[PDB]
Design an enzyme around this catalytic site. Structure first.
Site, PDB file in Angstrom:
ATOM      1  N   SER A 129       0.838  -1.202   0.000  1.00 56.99           N
ATOM      2  CA  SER A 129       0.000   0.000   0.000  1.00 56.99           C
ATOM      3  C   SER A 129       0.881   1.265   0.000  1.00 56.99           C
ATOM      4  O   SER A 129       1.751   1.417  -0.860  1.00 56.99           O
ATOM      5  CB  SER A 129      -0.942  -0.040   1.219  1.00 56.99           C
ATOM      6  OG  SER A 129      -2.149   0.662   1.015  1.00 56.99           O
TER       7      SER A 129
ATOM      8  N   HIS B 254      -7.399  -5.808  -0.816  1.00 54.03           N
ATOM      9  CA  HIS B 254      -6.269  -4.924  -0.840  1.00 54.03           C
ATOM     10  C   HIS B 254      -5.046  -5.657  -0.301  1.00 54.03           C
ATOM     11  O   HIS B 254      -4.977  -5.960   0.897  1.00 54.03           O
ATOM     12  CB  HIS B 254      -6.578  -3.668  -0.033  1.00 54.03           C
ATOM     13  CG  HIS B 254      -5.442  -2.704   0.037  1.00 54.03           C
ATOM     14  ND1 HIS B 254      -4.755  -2.280  -1.081  1.00 54.03           N
ATOM     15  CD2 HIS B 254      -4.862  -2.084   1.094  1.00 54.03           C
ATOM     16  CE1 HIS B 254      -3.809  -1.433  -0.715  1.00 54.03           C
ATOM     17  NE2 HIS B 254      -3.851  -1.298   0.600  1.00 54.03           N
TER      18      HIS B 254
ATOM     19  N   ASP C  92      -8.751  -4.548  -6.360  1.00 54.39           N
ATOM     20  CA  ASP C  92      -8.304  -3.912  -5.126  1.00 54.39           C
ATOM     21  C   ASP C  92      -9.012  -2.550  -4.981  1.00 54.39           C
ATOM     22  O   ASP C  92      -8.805  -1.646  -5.793  1.00 54.39           O
ATOM     23  CB  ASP C  92      -6.785  -3.745  -5.129  1.00 54.39           C
ATOM     24  CG  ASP C  92      -6.235  -3.259  -3.795  1.00 54.39           C
ATOM     25  OD1 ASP C  92      -6.947  -2.506  -3.079  1.00 54.39           O
ATOM     26  OD2 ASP C  92      -5.070  -3.622  -3.468  1.00 54.39           O
TER      27      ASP C  92
END
EC number: 3.4.21.-
Length: 463
Positions: A171, A433, A406
């Site tokens: 991320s 995610h 995602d």
């Protein structure tokens, strides 16, 4: 780094000084917190991870990751997590809000975008930025951005006795990665970026892509649930958004947007509209949480909101004694310096118009013609980075893992990052995610081979 055992593994903990301002090397100092799970076999070096956020503790992440690390990886690498400057156990920690401050915000429906509404939100934001400067001082805030976390990362590499860095970033951690890749390319042994942030993206269009991501995860969750007995969103997934709003809209007073009418909960707070949306968003990070969302929505059918409250708490990082960790406060402060903020009212108003259309599950009532500026439009300290195409020509081939649906970091962003980095794209077909070291043996197989043998996945590798 003087290591010490940890006060759940072979774990060793220690600190590392880095300068708050790198141009003033002998000035204020920060102490970064580090955890290390020594390798069981022949050590190649340290695998340094970062969970993202920003504001998320890497030490906490390494503890979780430790449980799901493949045996070949744990044989060959020290697993090492760290808390970035200002985050979690690193001193000084970023703090702006009291526990009560956070609670007070979350009680509000946060749904009124009339001029009075927007003035209210924007006034809270100014008070928030004031509490930040008050508790932190403008200097520490000025230097908490990724550009300086990248430099800390080289200090950490060195301190760990590694000639080159082996790094896994999830991320926001993919921003740390590409930043480090640009400043220290010749120090990257290997690098996996899972759930990609495109540093070349327009901030508004990215937000709108993220809104589309979550609306699609919503679509997917709801289609799944529609096949299941007693779906609280109904058996017709084309009507799930409406049904969802028949369940959350009554948490807002119909004649006055500013009045919360929270669902009953065992906790004193009850469930506000805003916490209802947040808990929903949280559950959409992973199909592992779809059951919980379905529970939270069934509860709403009875005017209950316990599960959705607990989901929002998970997202918000509020423990059961009502204490928050600093991830929320750090996230903002770090985001606010990583790029120039959007300050144009018209663009902000137009984004809201578009967002209500792209992600109706999230929007309440009608477009009003007004929308609030984000916290970053009010930041008292300028961006220490700026959107650009990643350029790191001599970089070792890296692996970008991107998941088809995602919601947080969309698939295309993964494609674009890999492009700029001229590395490999490994697709995961899924609605979640990130995915590395989270159960899928195919992904982990590629990632293990890349980490040890340096072997990249073939073009079009899917998993």
């Amino acid at each position: 780094v003087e290591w010490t055992p940890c006060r759940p593994g072979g774990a060793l903990c220690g600190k590392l000084a880095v300068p708050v301002d790198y141009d003033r090397p002998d000035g204020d100092v920060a102490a970064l917190a580090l955890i290390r799970f020594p390798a069981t076999g022949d050590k190649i070096g340290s695998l340094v991870i970062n969970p993202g956020g920003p504001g998320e503790s890497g030490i906490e992440a390494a503890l979780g990751v430790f449980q799901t690390l493949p045996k070949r990886v744990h044989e060959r690498f020290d697993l090492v997590g760290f808390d970035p400057r200002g985050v979690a156990s690193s001193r000084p920690a970023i703090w702006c809000n009291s526990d009560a401050d956070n609670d007070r915000l979350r009680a509000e429906p946060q749904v009124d975008y009339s001029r009075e509404g927007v003035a209210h939100i924007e006034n809270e934001t100014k008070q928030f930025v004031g509490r930040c400067v008050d508790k932190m001082g403008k200097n520490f805030l000025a230097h908490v951005g990724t550009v300086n976390v990248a430099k800390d990362l080289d200090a950490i590499r060195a301190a760990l006795g590694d000639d080159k860095l082996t790094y896994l970033g999830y991320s926001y951690g993919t921003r740390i990665g590409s930043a480090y890749a640009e400043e220290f390319p010749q120090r990257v042994r290997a690098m996996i970026l899972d759930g990609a942030v495109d540093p070349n993206a327009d901030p508004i269009e990215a937000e709108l892509r993220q809104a589309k991501g979550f609306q699609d995860a919503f679509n997917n969750y709801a289609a799944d649930c529609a096949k299941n007995a007693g779906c609280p969103l109904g058996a017709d997934p084309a009507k799930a958004v409406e049904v969802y709003h028949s369940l959350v809209d009554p948490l807002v007073d119909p004649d006055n947007p500013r009045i919360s009418r929270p669902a009953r909960t065992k906790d004193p707070r009850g469930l506000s509209y805003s916490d209802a949306i947040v808990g929903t968003i949280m559950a959409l990070y992973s199909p592992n949480l779809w059951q919980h969302l379905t529970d939270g929505l069934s509860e709403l059918v009875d005017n209950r909101g316990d599960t959705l409250l607990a989901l929002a708490d998970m997202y918000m990082r509020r423990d059961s004694h009502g204490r928050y960790n600093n991830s929320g406060d750090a996230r903002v402060a770090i985001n606010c310096v990583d790029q120039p903020p959007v300050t144009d009212r018209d663009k902000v108003i137009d984004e809201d118009r578009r967002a209500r259309e792209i992600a109706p599950f999230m929007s309440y009532g009608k477009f009003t013609g007004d929308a609030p500026l984000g916290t970053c439009a009010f930041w008292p300290v300028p961006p220490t980075s700026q959107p650009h195409a990643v350029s790191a020509p001599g970089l070792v081939p890296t692996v970008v893992v991107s998941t088809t649906h995602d919601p947080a970091t969309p698939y295309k962003a993964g494609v674009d990052l890999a492009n700029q980095l001229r590395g490999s794209l490994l697709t995961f077909d899924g609605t979640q995610h990130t995915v590395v070291f989270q159960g899928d043996s195919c992904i982990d197989e590629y990632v293990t081979a890349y980490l040890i043998g340096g072997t990249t996945p073939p073009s079009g590798a899917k998993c």
